[PDB]
Design a protein around this nucleic acid. Structure first.
Length: 51
RNA sequence: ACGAGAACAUACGUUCUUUGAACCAAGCUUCAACUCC
């Protein structure tokens, strides 16, 4: 079933939609962890072509 | 004082002419740059 799913990449997202976040863990109460990862800012549209 | 004596089975002559080791065939199939604290 996965040999017949054709998914491509996306078009090149503009570089202004990237934002560096703090990785926070929330088990009982939120506390930060020293790890920043460069994510996308929310409500950002990314376009794929899947067949 | 031998059915004997003398006498090269020798001379000449391209294993040679024509002939694709070719034809067909995806280096591909399945994978999250990821999990934990």
């Amino acid at each position: 079933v996965f040999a017949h799913l054709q998914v491509s990449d996306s078009e090149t997202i503009d570089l202004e939609n990237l934002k560096v976040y703090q990785k926070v863990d929330y088990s009982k109460t939120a506390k930060p962890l020293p790890l920043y990862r460069e994510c996308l800012k929310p409500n950002t549209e990314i376009t794929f072509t899947v067949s």
